[PDB]
Symmetry: none
Subunit: 341 residues, 2 copies
């Protein structure tokens, strides 16, 4: 499934205990500009964006039309309901040929806590299942504001309990992208505080680790994103849109009795990272959430948890499911499958 891919010279270093892998978008450009395939999608950001705080309008921009599917029949995709903790959760269940025992992956889609659908990343996960021969749960977890924090977190815990009671030898890898990664990270933390040790790995695609962090702070500073002149207005406008989204989405996700800076809403602000599973983070050079993902990686490493931080040069937010658009998305699938076997 991974042919026609470029031979990229990646750069691997160790920074504060973090294994860092920087992958340029080609071998002639090391950084500081968008991958050209990304750039052609960002034409709108030549002008500033004003994000209207309207739920339906926001949701209406969170459906990805079908991605070309090279896997086809080689992986079965079927929906079913599971029930634990008096919560019924719909999951899109992926089964490959010759499925392997015990190892299972649980995935939460992104969509800024309030939107998206699991179908947004089906094809990416078919690639992962087909390569690793691992079964995958693509979870239709609760969305805010109708079911704000901690509903999605509790759905995750329900899923983990179901899997562990189903099979005592199960090894669970948790994964997600964006706000979905945030929710499953919190569920994982909670699973561990109840004494389960079955989750042995996190695979996080551009996670939101600190929702609604200070937008005049170091996590939201555009000076951390050097870029060529011709693309600096586009980058500024793009980053500013995500700054707007960060506030709007957190308001939806967090009810009034709760707070966004708490450990279960901002995994970056956990008091302790010693229980956290070995983690791989994958993120674009120009992802507005990259600094907080890096800060998270450094906290894990300092707690002596093995952490790999793969930075895709020239990439923005939300690229990974787009396997028919970017080689980097195909690489994300490869990296995930290798982590499961």
């Amino acid at each position: 499934y991974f042919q026609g891919m470029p031979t990229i010279n990646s750069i691997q270093t160790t920074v504060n205990g973090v294994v860092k892998i920087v992958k340029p978008f080609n071998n002639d450009i090391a950084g500081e500009q968008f991958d050209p395939h990304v750039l052609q999608t960002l034409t709108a950001f030549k002008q500033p964006a004003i994000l209207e705080n309207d739920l339906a309008a926001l949701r209406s921009g969170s459906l990805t039309p079908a991605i070309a599917d090279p896997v086809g029949d080689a992986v079965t995709v079927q929906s079913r309901n599971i029930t634990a903790l008096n919560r019924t959760v719909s999951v899109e269940w992926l089964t490959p040929q010759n499925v392997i025992n015990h190892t299972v992956l649980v995935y939460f889609h992104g969509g800024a806590f309030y939107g998206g659908v699991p179908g947004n990343n089906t094809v990416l996960l078919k690639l992962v299942a087909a390569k690793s021969h691992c079964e995958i749960l693509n979870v239709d977890y609760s969305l805010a504001p109708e079911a704000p924090a901690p509903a999605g977190i509790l759905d995750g815990l329900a899923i983990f309990q179901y899997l562990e009671q189903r099979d005592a030898e199960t090894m669970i890898t948790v994964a997600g992208d964006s706000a979905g990664a945030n929710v499953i990270m919190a569920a994982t933390n909670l699973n561990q505080q109840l004494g389960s040790n079955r989750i042995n790995q996190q695979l996080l695609l551009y996670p939101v680790t600190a929702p609604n962090a200070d937008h005049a702070g170091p996590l939201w500073d555009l000076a951390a994103f050097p870029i060529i002149d011709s693309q600096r207005a586009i980058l500024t406008n793009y980053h500013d849109l995500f700054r707007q989204l960060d506030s709007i989405m957190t308001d939806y996700y967090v009810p009034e009795n709760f707070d966004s800076h708490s450990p279960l809403i901002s995994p970056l602000h956990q008091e302790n990272f010693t229980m956290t599973p070995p983690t791989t983070i994958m993120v674009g050079e120009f992802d507005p959430f990259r600094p907080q993902a890096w800060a998270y990686a450094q906290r894990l490493a300092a707690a002596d948890t093995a952490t790999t931080f793969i930075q895709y040069q020239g990439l923005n937010h939300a690229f990974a499911p787009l396997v028919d658009q970017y080689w980097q998305s195909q690489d994300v699938a490869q990296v995930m499958a290798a982590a499961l076997i």
Copy 2:
């Protein structure tokens, strides 16, 4: 929304604003969008149409379409009564509805079939983006209620809306055969002297049911395509030619005629009262030539007319918002025409 910007091509032809949108930036036309092509594998051989009502109706139902909006747009069934006709409507109401503007939509389904639910998600997208309330009408279906029952259901809806709010501005819309019915109802509403309908939004409309199949509106030569896809197009086009006769037969009772102005809007004697219109249609839709012929007649009556051609696309694509970027573009074009 990682969509590579598509570079559309806008020209003006006989007063018609024509907007051609390639399915990507490498290919300008003359082949199917690969997303569409993978659904047409069966058409490597001639198709077999099961000509009986139950089979035809079952084939006019869309399987479930992913819905990203959910409860953020309210959807409820209400009946309205006007002209002694009771019409069920699936009503879509967004949060913070705008005043006076309202959209009335008629589903496709070849006059005998389809259900409002076929295009519910598409319309939630439109309501979300426009803040406009939408009536997704369950209009009368042939042959139990053939022409002009659906037309009269449309007129009853318009009367209900206009007596409800004297300053309402109505946009009428629909796809395929539904567009046909609501276009005729619009014509009728205008002939009774209402001017509250100020726009039409037409998704691959059937403007001339059962037109001459040996004539220019049904000539395959109008659809140049690469050799590797000619067989598929030929069989797809042939299926629709057959369906054209069958559906018109169900729709049109013996005492009436398909060539008449109220069954074939293309054959209206006069287009001067016709509202400003946007038509959206695929490059390989068999009803594309009759849609274009209609647009030309509009523009010749000095009515603002926009014709949007989606390259590589076939018939009935618009509700499938989880399948094609073009389906979402349709929702955006419609939302933009309502605000």
